[PDB]
Design a protein around this ligand. Structure first.
Ligand SMILES: Nc1nc2c(ncn2[C@@H]2O[C@H](COP(=O)(O)OP(=O)(O)NP(=O)(O)O)[C@@H](O)[C@H]2O)c(=O)[nH]1
Ligand SMILES: Nc1nc2c(ncn2[C@@H]2O[C@H](COP(=O)(O)OP(=O)(O)NP(=O)(O)O)[C@@H](O)[C@H]2O)c(=O)[nH]1
Lengths: 47, 178, 411
RNA sequence: CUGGAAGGUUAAGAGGAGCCGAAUUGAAGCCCCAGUAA
RNA sequence: UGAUAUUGAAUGUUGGUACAGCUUGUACAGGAUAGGUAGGAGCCUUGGAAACCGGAGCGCCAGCUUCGGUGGAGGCAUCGGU
RNA sequence: GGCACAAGGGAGCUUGACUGCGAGACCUACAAGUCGAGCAGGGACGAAAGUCGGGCUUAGUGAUCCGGUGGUUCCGCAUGGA
């Protein structure tokens, strides 16, 4: 398992930091939650 | 061998011909931080300026003198064709979108960039004023009189010097070639 | 595996990016002159993809630039960094000239944009005629996702170190070993800046050699955090188990340099260089052999080796010497046999108010280490501890490696 | 330890064809010379 | 243990600076196959301007840059865009 | 310490596994340190109200003087900027 940071798409900054397994999920996942700066929930992707 | 004067060279570039009198000026990269590149409206002074106005700014762009504005996107008409004419300016909203299209403006010298005062909200005032460390500047014609190029070179030199670059230390002047 | 390389001009966040990709070995300062001076390797991870990374540099400038060209060709894709705050400079096109004739894929990057408002001003960067620029930031992890994908699109054991003081020939030593031009050699002191990795195979056995650019006196290090490079040497020592020491054919700092290695519980080997420089005739080696023995006595297990980099003599013997030190540093013994001899030592020296010996056993095998079960932990004498040390180092080899000894109480 | 290059090896390889390895290059070390015995 | 002032005079050996003058960048075009700044406001002329034959630098070892008398008021044609 | 009403399974995507914020237990030496009331902003199969997680405490050494890099409607020593 490794540590991962999530990046905002609309606003464009790191908001959430977490962990995932390389083998089970070898690809980049689309997580959807709140971006506080935008005052509105936006899609997130990891870098 | 002799460095002529400004009052002699304007009357003499009459005799170096309807041609255009232009000025080279060697600047004094190390100093790229305080480089000297720019544009200013001219005193003693045909272009075809096409604009990329967005929203309400097209409504004041069609009365100032511009030839073609657009249907809010004609870069697809720019793709596979597009004999560009004179000057491309834009507005600070669609500049990023036009820019993400590629170097159809890179090696052609018309890419909108707000360092030059050409990408702004005042498109009506922008149409009306445009119509190795070196700057080129067209100050005028052969057929202008002797008192026109003196103010033209004076205005351009005061613009250069008004802009006394930071790191002013060391000589700023190297050469004027009229 | 795929190889990636980054090139550019002084002050473009390259070493910085490379570190942000993985690790912090790359040295980072703020000034024009201080840049990574040579190639360095590493490993990366981006999805199933797992390519590496080659870092380059911007007095002597021809060599490093040439080294960069070496990287240029043997690479798979090209990373071309450039600054965003100050637009386009002369050096940008200067390097662009060779990039144009470089029949390799190119991915451009723009740094120094760490805020949304600064994300603009990319249209100007359309001169190269290359593809789409993708902004990145060093202080923050911005815009890296687009860059990596841009790269992934075209994308399809022991270790020993050598140390010394600056201006001795340590860089010349290595390159010659591989027989390959790998690191820069100059006649000025402290030419190398930071540690460089080098992996190679010898006799069906792979090895990893490392440089540490030499070290000056500890009061002599007053520079723009050039200790920041000195620490990299320290980390390198921790990374590998075997250290070779290189002296030129004696100064007390060389003893001080050997100070860190001995306490580190890492095998250490003595090497000399430039033997051609001095007189070389009958029985010459003895003078140095006892001088180093007389000077260096807190270490004894270190074998003495002789080589001269320039004429390349006896260099073959160096490698094997390293292998022998290895298992010695990783060796356990049967506890029965060890305790079998502990008494003989005490029989011959029945003068330890008196200490008593009951048991001793090997615990730490990573570095030869053991523990003795005695009656009074205070009653001992360091000379007696030095006595039991030699006896054991004479019963078996344990040569070329240090030994740590512990004395627990009866409990 | 000392020269003088001859006798080849070139050494892990650097390279690789067919199928793990062709050819082809490749320092030392082996006197392959004795003097030397420290 | 290296710099610098005492420390001065002439030889040659060179250097480094600047100042002129001359010459240099062959490339995937364009009579070949050349670095950052205008599409002309042609030259008649001249080791050949067609062919024509020296000279380096050379060569990108291709094929050029001009010093350039035969043909020569003929010639490429400012002129266009592998 | 659970008896399925907390170890099956379409959708509900999905680590609100969040941004604001707070009454009591502690140890009650306190600092500190910990664990769980109560609420605007849509942010959910959601429809009746259920959401700050992997259902015993067991961690990423101390998360810090760890800032040197960065947004500043805050100051700026006579007035502008730095
Ligand atoms: N403001 C800002 N500064 C940055 C950013 N990235 C790097 N820097 C600064 O730029 C400095 C130069 O980077 P560094 O990696 O040291 O460059 P280098 O080692 O000389 N290699 P190279 O010059 O080729 O990039 C860094 O020390 C850092 O202070 C960034 O995104 N923003
Ligand atoms: N005569 C002789 N010179 C040598 C020998 N080995 C190296 N040299 C020379 O001594 C100098 C030292 O070069 P270098 O390898 O950079 O030594 P270093 O500075 O200690 N290594 P680093 O650059 O990493 O600090 C070079 O001029 C090199 O040619 C040798 O065995 N004999």
């Amino acid at each position: 398992r490794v540590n991962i940071t999530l990046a905002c798409t609309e606003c464009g900054e790191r908001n959430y930091i977490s962990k995932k397994n390389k083998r089970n999920n070898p690809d980049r996942v689309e997580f959807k939650k709140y971006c506080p700066r935008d005052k509105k929930s936006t899609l997130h992707r990891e870098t | 061998s002799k460095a002529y004067d400004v009052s002699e060279a304007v009357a003499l570039v009459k005799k170096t011909n309807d041609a255009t009198v232009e000025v080279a000026f060697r600047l004094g990269p190390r100093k790229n931080d305080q480089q000297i590149r720019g544009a200013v409206v001219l005193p003693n002074g045909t272009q075809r300026v096409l604009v990329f106005a967005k929203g309400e700014k097209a409504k004041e762009a069609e009365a100032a003198g511009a030839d073609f504005v657009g249907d809010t996107d004609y870069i697809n008409k720019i793709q596979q064709g597009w004999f560009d004419f004179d000057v491309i300016v834009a507005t600070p909203d669609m500049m990023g979108e036009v820019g993400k299209i590629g170097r159809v403006l890179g090696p052609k010298g018309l890419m909108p960039n707000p360092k030059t005062g050409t990408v702004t909200f005042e498109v009506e005032k922008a149409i009306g004023e445009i119509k190795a460390g070196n700057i080129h500047v067209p100050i005028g014609k052969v057929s202008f009189e002797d008192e026109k190029l003196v103010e033209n070179f004076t205005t351009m030199y005061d613009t250069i010097l008004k802009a006394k670059p930071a790191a002013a230390k060391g000589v700023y002047v190297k050469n004027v070639a009229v | 595996k795929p190889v990636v390389a980054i090139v550019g001009r002084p002050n473009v966040g390259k070493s910085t990016i490379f570190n942000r990709i993985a690790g912090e070995r790359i040295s980072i300062v703020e000034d024009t002159p201080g840049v990574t001076r040579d190639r360095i390797y590493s490993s990366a991870e981006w999805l199933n993809y797992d390519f590496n990374l080659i870092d380059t540099g911007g007095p002597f400038l021809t060599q490093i630039r040439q080294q960069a060209e070496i990287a240029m060709d043997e690479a798979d894709v090209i990373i071309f960094m450039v600054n965003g705050r100050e637009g386009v400079t002369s050096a940008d096109e200067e390097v662009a000239k060779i990039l144009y004739r470089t029949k390799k894929p190119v991915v451009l990057a723009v740094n120094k944009l760490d805020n949304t408002e600064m994300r603009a001003n990319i249209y100007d960067f359309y001169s190269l005629g290359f593809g789409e620029p993708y902004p990145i930031s060093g202080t923050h992890g911005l815009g890296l996702g687009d860059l990596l994908d841009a790269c992934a699109e075209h994308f399809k054991v022991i270790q020993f170190c050598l140390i010394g003081r600056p201006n001795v020939g340590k860089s010349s030593l290595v390159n010659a070993m591989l027989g390959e031009e790998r690191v820069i050699v100059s006649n000025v002191a402290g030419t190398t800046r930071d540690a460089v990795d080098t992996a190679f195979t010898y006799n069906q056995q792979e090895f990893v050699i490392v440089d540490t650019a030499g070290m000056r006196k500890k009061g002599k290090v007053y520079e723009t955090t050039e200790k920041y490079s000195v620490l990299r040497a320290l980390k390198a020592i921790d990374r590998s188990e075997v250290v070779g020491v290189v002296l030129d054919g004696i100064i007390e700092q060389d003893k001080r340099i050997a100070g860190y290695a001995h306490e580190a519980g890492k095998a250490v080997v003595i090497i000399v260089n430039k033997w051609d420089a001095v007189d070389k005739d009958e029985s010459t080696m003895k003078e140095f052999e006892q001088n180093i023995r007389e000077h260096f006595q807190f270490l004894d297990y270190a074998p003495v080796l002789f080589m001269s980099a320039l004429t390349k003599k006896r260099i073959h013997t160096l490698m094997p010497a390293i292998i022998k030190a290895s298992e010695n540093h990783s060796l356990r013994v049967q506890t029965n046999v060890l305790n079998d001899v502990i008494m003989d030592a005490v029989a011959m020296n029945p003068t330890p108010s008196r200490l008593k010996i009951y048991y001793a056993t090997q615990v730490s095998v990573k570095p030869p280490s053991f523990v003795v079960f005695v009656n009074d932990p205070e009653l001992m004498h360091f000379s007696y501890e030095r006595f039991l040390e030699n006896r054991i180092r004479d019963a078996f080899g344990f040569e070329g490696t240090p030994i740590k000894i512990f004395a627990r109480a009866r409990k």
